[PDB]
Ligand binder design. Sequence first.
Ligand SMILES: *[C@@H]1O[C@H](CO)[C@@H](O)[C@H](O)[C@H]1NC(C)=O
Ligand SMILES: *[C@@H]1O[C@H](CO)[C@@H](O)[C@H](O)[C@H]1NC(C)=O
Lengths: 50, 49
Amino acid sequence: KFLPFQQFGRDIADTTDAVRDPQTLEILDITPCSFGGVSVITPGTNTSNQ
Amino acid sequence: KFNGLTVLPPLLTDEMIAQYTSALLAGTITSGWTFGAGAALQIPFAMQM
Ligand SMILES: *[C@@H]1O[C@H](CO)[C@@H](O)[C@H](O)[C@H]1NC(C)=O
Ligand SMILES: *[C@@H]1O[C@H](CO)[C@@H](O)[C@H](O)[C@H]1NC(C)=O
């Protein structure tokens, strides 16, 4: 919920949190895209390759 | 978690740790202390006291 004059919420430390939009009045929310650190598990390459 | 920080879960869950602690307690209460050297033996608790 926003006050009738509140925009550009940070709300944790510095991140641009849920923000309103122009041309309309809705409290949109911004979430970072999915990310992760991939890893590879392998047996001895002298044995196989899968 | 958003920016760049990730946390990895531990290899052994809490249930496994509880199982090890239960096994140690069960060994101590009946086997005495022979299972700390070799095979587990049995002996009444009063004799161990
Ligand atoms: C913006 O202009 C469009 C085009 O007519 C109109 O439909 C809309 O209601 C306007 N919105 C605002 C907030 O002025
Ligand atoms: C394992 O590696 C050694 C040398 O790195 C190789 O001589 C041996 O053939 C390998 N094992 C198999 C099953 O190929």
